[PDB]
Amino acid sequence: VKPNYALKFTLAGHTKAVSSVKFSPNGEWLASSSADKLIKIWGAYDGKFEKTISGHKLGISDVAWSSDSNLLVSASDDKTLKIWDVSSGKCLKTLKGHSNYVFCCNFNPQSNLIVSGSFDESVRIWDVKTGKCLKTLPAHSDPVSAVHFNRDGSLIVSSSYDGLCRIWDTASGQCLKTLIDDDNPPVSFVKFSPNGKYILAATLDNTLKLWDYSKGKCLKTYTGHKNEKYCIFANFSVTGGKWIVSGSEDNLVYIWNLQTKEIVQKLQGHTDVVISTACHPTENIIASAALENDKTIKLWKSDC
């Protein structure tokens, strides 16, 4: 039954809205990005501040870790992505090609590719080793809110303000599936399940949906939260009970039972929109992050 997430740490340091928080795949770290143009690294278990990584000329929407936890990629309003050495804090590559703000980014599981989505309505696939753009997908007809690889990196899912989710063949760059639902509200977030079998999508009508994307069938929805404006990150939590975790525009983190769709916990504490949540890879730990009235990251721990 219910999780019992309690507040363990509040991480202050960013001087503007925080955009994204991500745990390293090794479970060691949390990375955060912010409108303040900075990436900060924190200890996942002790909340200790480790380092600040700088170099972007404008605010940063997203950050993501390579599979060996040695590299970070960030997506910035400055129209670039940057690849960072976590150890030195140094910018290794600047990925240039997008014609407007880059909103979202991920490594493939192999961590030889980066996928990016932009205000410029494209999705780009980049070679990690060289930093070169390998493919530009004419992905959507409005800003791209999220990009994610499946478990083997053979597929990419993207979401957009155009009301669509798309599934892409990574190797060829061909669209394999376009999802539509209801009256096509903006799709503000999407990701694959840990196994790759499903996609979880948020739309700006206060709804998360779980999809069997190949069958084109919605299996569950998660509602009760507030999501009408911001591109709020959501997650599968699989270390204990099977939960859906999301931020919300009423300053709370919402946790649902994945199967029953019931709200099982609401986490109070933040003082602005919780735009990002992350789930720890091995421990029942949530990181959550909030917008400019708050600017803090919170770490929470549960027994299941």
Ligand X SMILES: Cc1cccc(C(=O)Nc2cc(-c3ccc4[nH]ccc4c3)ccc2N2CCN(C)CC2)c1
Q: Which is nearer to ligand X, 59 or 97 (CB)?
A: 59
Task: Give 123's contacts (C-beta < 8 A, 6+ positions apart).
Answer: 115, 116, 117, 136, 137, 139, 140, 144, 147, 156, 158, 168
Element (H, E) at 187: strand 187-192
Query: Kind of pairing, strands 285-290 and 274-279?
Result: antiparallel
The tokens for 219 are 């299996």
Stretch binding ligand X (CB under 6 A), from 4-12, 44-52, 124-132, 226-234: 226-234
Q: Are 288 and 254 in contact (CB under 8 A)?
A: no
For residue 159, state whether it binds ligand X (rule: CB under 6 A).
no
CA distance 71 to 78: 20
Q: Which of 11, 31, 44, 104 binds ligand X (CB under 6 A)?
A: 104
| Non-local CB neighbours of 24 within 8 Å, separated by 6+ positions | 30, 31, 44, 65, 69, 86
User: Closer to ligand X at the Cβ: 111 or 227?
Assistant: 227
Q: Does 276 bind ligand X (CB under 6 A)?
A: yes
Instruction: Tell me the residue number closest to ligand X, measured at CB.
Output: 59
Q: With CB under 6 A as the contact rule, which of the stretches 44-52, 209-217, 227-235, 263-271 interacts with ligand X?
A: 227-235
Rounded distance between C-alpha atoms, residue 43 and residue 90, angstroms: 19
Residue 73 engages ligand X in binding (rule: CB under 6 A): no
Binding test (CB under 6 A) with ligand X, winner from 30, 60, 165, 253: 60
Task: Choose which of 208, 231, 244, 297 interacts with ligand X (CB under 6 A).
Answer: 231
Which of 142, 63, 62, 56 lies closest to 103, judged by CA? Answer: 62
Examine residue 55 and tell whether it contacts ligand X (CB under 6 A). no
Least CB distance from residue 214 to ligand X, whole Å? 26
Cβ of residue 119: shortest distance to ligand X, in angstroms? 6
Q: Which is nearer to ligand X, 62 or 249 (CB)?
A: 62
Q: Does 145 bind ligand X (CB under 6 A)?
A: yes
Sole binder of ligand X in the list 38, 165, 258, 275 (CB under 6 A): 275
Instruction: Round to whole Å and give the CA distance between 120 and 58.
Output: 16
Q: Report how far apart, in Å, the C-alpha atoms of 73 and of each of 77, 96, 155 are.
A: 14, 13, 19
Q: Which residues bind ligand X (CB under 6 A)?
A: 17, 19-20, 35, 59-62, 103-104, 143, 145, 161, 230-231, 233, 275-276
